[PDB]
Every structure is written in C-alpha cells, then in structure tokens.
Write a protein that binds this ligand. Structure first.
Ligand SMILES: Cc1cnc(Nc2ccc(N3CCN(C)CC3)c(F)c2)nc1Nc1ccc(Cl)c(NS(=O)(=O)C(C)(C)C)c1
Length: 127
C-alpha cells in the first residue's frame, strides 16, 4: 500500500550533457505538456496511498511522471534526447497498462501524447 521513493533526479556520477535536442525537450515539449489542462494528474508521482490504489506500485514497476522529467531536465540529468523521450513514453505506457480504455485518465494521457508526438516530430537535428 505504501509509496516507493520517487525516481532518481540527481546523480553526480552519471554522465550528462546539455544538447540542443535536450533544450528543445525542456523549452518546447515539457513546457507544452505541462501547461495543458490535462497535465495535473501527471505533474508528480502518483500518490497511491491518497488515491487508495494499493496495487498501483505493485503493477507499475517503472513509474514516471512529468514532475520527475521536469527536474531531470532542469538538472541536466540526461545524456541524450532518447533517454528523456523514453521517460515520456514510459509515463504514457504506464497509464495505458494500469487503466481501462476510455477512462478519463486515459483520455487525458492520449491528449498529452498526441501533442508530445507532434512536438517530437519536429525535434531538431543534433548540432
Ligand atoms: C498518472 C495516473 C495514472 N493512473 C491513474 N489511475 C487511477 C485509477 C483510478 C482512480 N480512482 C478511481 C476513483 N476512485 C474513487 C479513486 C481511485 C484514480 F484515482 C487514479 N491515475 C493517475 N493519476 C492521477 C492523479 C490524481 C488523481 Cl485525482 C487521479 N484521479 S482520476 O484518474 O480519477 C482523474 C484524473 C480522471 C480525476 C489520477
């Protein structure tokens, strides 16, 4: 029933970079999704205690959320764009794994994912 610690957002020994693609992922992709009317359920780790979902972290073994992504981007935690893109995809996929088609939370994820895909279609070439 208990919540796990959140995903790591700081690790001094992890090699990391700031690339133009990672800057786009913060300034365009994260910013666009974060301001969306459906962002709020995804802006922090799921509190499975307060939502009374004792099975949540028993089923979702690789949790991810945009609060964590935002911190990772702000801290320049990533090595490359694909690592960050993977975090977004994990977040969406986790939603579809845990919930049912047509559930409000799924509709919310689908709207965010549509925008995500539109923005990453225009990811700049690495300079
Ligand atoms: C990211 C994420 C992924 N998956 C889920 N699943 C989920 C499934 C069932 C429920 N409940 C169904 C109704 N019960 C009375 C309480 C439990 C739930 F709260 C969440 N939750 C997520 N975040 C999240 C964050 C905060 C809120 Cl308040 C919501 N609630 S909600 O999904 O019902 C909605 C956003 C539509 C109000 C979800």
């Amino acid at each position: 029933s208990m919540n796990p610690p959140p995903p790591e957002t700081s690790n001094p020994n992890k090699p990391k970079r700031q690339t133009n693609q990672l800057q786009y992922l913060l300034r365009v992709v994260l910013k666009t999704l974060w301001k969306h009317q459906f962002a709020w359920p995804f802006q922090q780790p799921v509190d499975a205690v307060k939502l009374n979902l004792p099975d949540y972290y028993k089923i979702i073994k690789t949790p991810m959320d945009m609060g964590t992504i935002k911190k990772r981007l702000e801290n320049n935690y990533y090595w490359n764009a694909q690592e960050c893109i993977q975090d977004f995809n994990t977040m969406f996929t986790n939603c579809y794994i845990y919930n049912k088609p047509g559930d409000d939370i799924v509709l919310m994820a689908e709207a965010l994912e549509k925008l995500f895909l539109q923005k990453i279609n225009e990811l700049p070439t690495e300079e």
